Each structure stands twice: as structure tokens, then as C-alpha cells.
Design a protein around this ligand. Structure first.
Ligand SMILES: CC(C)c1noc2ncc(C(=O)N[C@H](C)c3cccc(S(N)(=O)=O)c3)cc12
Length: 472
């Protein structure tokens, strides 16, 4: 048909083959059709489609493409997409040109206006969205940026002039931003036994429990806000190149592991029962202040520490914990029950700012990654399951909706550093350290037939807590 005769030949262009059941699949369209699956070539073709813009697809593709296409390959494919061959002149125009006259070129002008110009401006739109929202690809690969700048810098056109200026404007802004707010007054920085500057005395019981929760919420808010959606796609934080692909997410996971294991270590290394009860009671108060601040990440870090194998079994310790703190800690656990039903209800019904629980997102993304195939098979051909990537992108979109919520709390550089540099494991591996904590639990509180021995005190300061009510 004349429609495919107008589009370029396959031997001069790869992005003009007609759609079929063996190269592209769509979802139930009840409007722009939603792409379920397709070859990389049909994904690139639709990413820069001549008939219409598709901001939703551009956003999803640029967040998830690294799971099926390398950044160097994506740039090559969009540049190949941009270089559209022009058709030959008609017979009458060939005679007109050979006679020294100007051709009519009716179909060539139509093809340029209705196909070459829209596809080229759509490739430029991908380049703009790429540098605006995923500039880290260019920071991790300076050669990729050199190729991008050479490409946009050699583009020649009247409508493409403004596009090339907007892309350049963004690249330079990002480059400078690499190097170089409070609506209300923040509260007074709380102190308990440790004095400001006496970093040598900073510890779980010497610092004020309000200030521990405040600084940890500030630290976790910054860690939460730095994670980009692509660090979570394709489960790249669990693969070989995880350090370069997921640096902000791995930092968040290592903080959560260090804080949780540090709380466990504080409890089980406090061998005197009366003192351990004080330690557990102080961590419950830290959780109470995390609840006040809507830091569900920290609340669930305390729930993980108390539910751990070494701590949960400490029946003699929790026996002396006041009934009200027992109830708070039990209700906090219930946040996780029934696939985090109460947690999700609390997150939606809360007023900002908040530090959501990050573990649930990682769990749900791993469920989506493992429970959906990388490709779909149609007529013996393999198509990239794009709906799989879209579903992971929707979960990361839920993460992004809470990343613009700064807290009105004053940073205390020394307390911040104390929590950034927590190393409970030391030179031990996680399995070695958790076995140590469990054997330590059995030492301080042996199994029921064996009795409870008495251990000496290790703290030369008052164990009484100053509480969770602030000083204003
Ligand atoms: C996963 C574990 C194995 C588990 N299995 O069934 C449960 N039912 C409830 C609770 C519970 O409430 N967890 C909180 C954080 C908690 C921890 C330690 C002491 C206390 S408490 N109430 O003694 O202060 C509370 C935990 C579990």
C-alpha cells in the first residue's frame, strides 16, 4: 500500500518496518495505545513516533531502559532513528533537476513535514528528558556525554535550533550543580548527659532520645531523597555493578543494617538486666519520636531490631518494660502485618513531611522482577516485556512522591557524624556478627531450664530517661 511505500525502505532504514504480532504487543486500549512488549527497534520507533508525543512512555522508558539496553546503545539507536533517508525525486522532478530547474518535490516536502521533522524533534525531546532527569548516565560515562554533545552540536535546522539550545542549557546547569528554606523556626537541639562537642561520650543512653530520633530522621530523609528510580530497576542493586548503578540505594540499605544491628548490639552487650531494660526502653522512646516525626523507616528499623532472633527472645527484659511501651511496640509491629496493610493506611492518611519505609518498595520490586519474565514469546521471536518495566516504574513513582518533604529540624553535625559512622559489625561479616549477637543473647538470658545469672553494671551514669516531651 502507498502508506508503506511513502516510508523508507528496510535496506536504508530500520525503524520503518510495519507492525506485526512478532515485533510489538499492546494492552487493552479502552487514545494513545499502551505498549506491552516489543523489540528494542519497535520500542525506539514508538519512543520517537511521528504521529504523536507520548510523555508517559518517554518517562517510563528513560527510567527503565538500562534493564534491556545499555546507555551507549540507546544513544546510537536514537541517532540512527534521527538519520532518516530522503526518497528519490520523481521521474518528472528528475527531468526538471537535470534541466537546471527547481523540482516540484510535492511528496518529498510532505515526507519532510509529516515524518522526518516530527521524528527528529521527538529524538531531540528524548535527549532533553535524558539529560534533565537522568544526567547520572553522563556523569558515570564522560564518553557518552561527549557523543551526546557532538550529536546535538552538529544538528542543523530552524525548529531544531531552539531544541539544541534547551538541551545545552540543561547539560551546563547539571555540570555546574555537581559543584555549586525553613518555613518556621526549628526546635531547640536537645541534650541529655553528653555535652555539645564531647563526641567521645556520645552513645545511645548519653544522647537525648529526642535528638537521636531527630538526627536519624534527618539522615534517613537525605538518604531516601537521593535514591533515583533507575537504581531499583532490573534489581541492579543485587548484581555485579551495583556500586556504580545503585550508590544511593546501597547507602540507604547499609545505614538501615548498621542502625538495626547497632540497636541489637546495645541491647545484648548490656548484660545487667536492669540496665538492658533501660536500653530497650530508650529505643522504644526513640521509636515514639520517629512516630511523632512520621519517620516510618525508623519505626520499622526499631521493629526489626526488637523482632530479631537475639532481642525478641529476651523475655526477662520485656517483662519489666512498662505496659504502655509494650503496647506502642506491639502496634508498631502490626504496621507490617497483612502485607503492611496498616502501614499503607497510615502513610496515605498522614500530613507531610515523612520518611517512608524503604524496605517494602524493595520487597515489591523484587516480587515484580522475579514474578514477570524478561521477554515475551510470539511466533518464535523474543519481545522485551515492557509492562514489567512499567510496573517497576510505577512502584518507584510512589517513592518519588515523598522525596520533596524536608524537615524543619536543625542538623547537629557531631550527632549526624556519630550515626553516619556506626560500624557495629567492625571487621566481622554480617552472618558472623548476627551469630555473635544470638550467642550473646543466650549468655545474658539462657534457655528456661538453665537459670538467669547476674552480671555487673557497665554504665557509670544515670539510666533514667529525660523522656519524649520537648523543652520549649
Ligand atoms: C516476628 C516475630 C518473631 C513475631 N512473631 O509474632 C509476633 N507477634 C508480635 C510481635 C511484636 O509485638 N513485635 C514487637 C516489635 C515487639 C518485639 C519485642 C517485644 C515486644 S513487647 N510487647 O514485649 O514490648 C514487642 C512480634 C512477633
Amino acid at each position: 500500500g502507498e502508506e508503506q511505500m511513502r516510508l523508507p525502505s528496510a535496506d536504508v532504514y530500520r525503524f520503518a518496518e510495519p507492525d506485526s504480532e512478532e515485533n510489538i504487543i499492546f494492552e487493552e486500549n479502552m487514545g494513545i495505545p499502551i505498549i506491552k512488549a516489543g523489540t528494542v527497534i519497535k520500542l525506539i520507533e514508538r519512543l520517537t513516533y511521528h504521529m504523536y508525543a507520548d510523555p508517559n512512555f518517554v518517562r517510563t522508558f528513560l527510567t527503565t531502559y538500562r534493564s534491556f539496553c545499555k546507555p551507549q546503545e540507546l544513544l546510537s539507536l536514537i541517532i540512527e532513528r534521527f538519520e532518516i533517508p530522503e526518497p528519490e525525486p520523481t521521474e518528472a522532478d528528475r527531468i526538471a533537476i537535470e534541466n537546471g530547474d527547481q523540482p516540484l518535490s510535492a511528496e518529498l516536502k510532505r515526507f519532510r513535514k509529516e515524518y522526518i521533522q516530527p521524528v527528529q524533534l521527538r529524538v531531540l525531546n528524548v535527549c532533553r528528558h535524558w539529560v534533565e532527569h537522568h544526567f547520572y548516565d553522563f556523569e558515570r560515562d564522560a564518553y557518552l556525554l561527549q557523543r551526546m554533545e557532538e550529536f546535538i552540536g552538529t544538528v542543523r535546522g530552524k525548529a531544531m535550533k531552539k531544541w539544541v539550545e534547551s538541551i545545552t542549557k540543561i547539560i551546563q546547569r547539571k555540570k555546574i550543580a555537581r559543584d555549586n528554606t525553613f518555613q518556621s523556626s526549628p526546635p531547640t537541639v536537645e541534650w541529655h548527659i553528653s555535652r555539645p562537642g564531647h563526641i567521645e561520650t556520645f552513645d545511645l543512653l548519653t544522647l537525648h532520645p529526642i535528638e537521636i530520633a531527630r538526627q536519624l530522621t534527618l539522615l534517613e530523609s537525605d538518604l531516601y531523597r537521593a535514591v533515583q528510580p533507575s537504581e531499583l530497576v532490573g534489581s541492579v542493586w543485587t548484581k555485579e555493578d551495583k556500586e556504580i548503578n545503585s550508590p544511593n540505594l546501597l547507602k540507604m540499605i547499609r545505614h538501615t543494617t548498621n542502625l538495626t544491628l547497632w540497636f541489637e548490639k546495645c541491647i545484648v552487650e548490656t548484660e545487667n538486666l536492669e540496665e538492658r531494660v533501660a536500653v530497650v526502653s530508650r529505643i522504644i522512646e526513640i521509636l515514639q519520636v520517629f512516630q511523632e516525626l512520621n519517620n516510618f523507616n525508623g519505626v520499622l528499623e526499631v521493629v526489626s531490631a526488637m523482632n530479631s532472633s537475639p532481642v525478641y527472645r529476651l523475655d526477662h527484659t520485656f517483662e519489666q518494660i512498662p505496659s504502655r511501651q509494650k503496647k506502642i511496640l506491639e502496634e508498631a509491629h502490626e504496621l507490617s502485618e497483612d502485607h503492611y496493610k496498616k502501614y499503607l493506611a497510615k502513610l496515605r492518611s498522614i500530613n507531610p513531611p515523612c520518611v517512608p519505609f524503604f524496605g517494602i518498595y524493595l520487597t515489591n520490586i523484587l516480587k515484580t522482577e522475579e514474578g514477570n519474565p524478561e521477554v515475551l514469546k510470539r511466533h518464535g521471536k523474543e519481545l522485551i516485556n515492557f509492562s514489567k518495566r512499567r510496573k517497576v516504574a510505577e512502584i518507584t513513582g510512589e517513592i518519588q512522591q515523598y522525596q520533596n518533604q524536608p524537615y524543619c529540624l536543625r542538623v547537629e553535625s557531631d550527632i549526624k557524624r556519630f550515626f553516619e559512622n556506626l560500624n557495629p559489625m567492625g571487621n566481622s561479616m554480617e552472618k558472623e556478627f548476627t551469630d555473635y549477637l544470638f550467642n550473646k543473647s543466650l549468655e545474658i538470658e539462657p534457655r528456661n531450664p538453665k537459670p538467669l545469672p547476674r552480671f555487673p553494671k557497665k554504665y557509670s551514669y544515670p539510666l533514667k530517661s529525660p523522656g519524649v516531651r520537648p523543652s520549649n
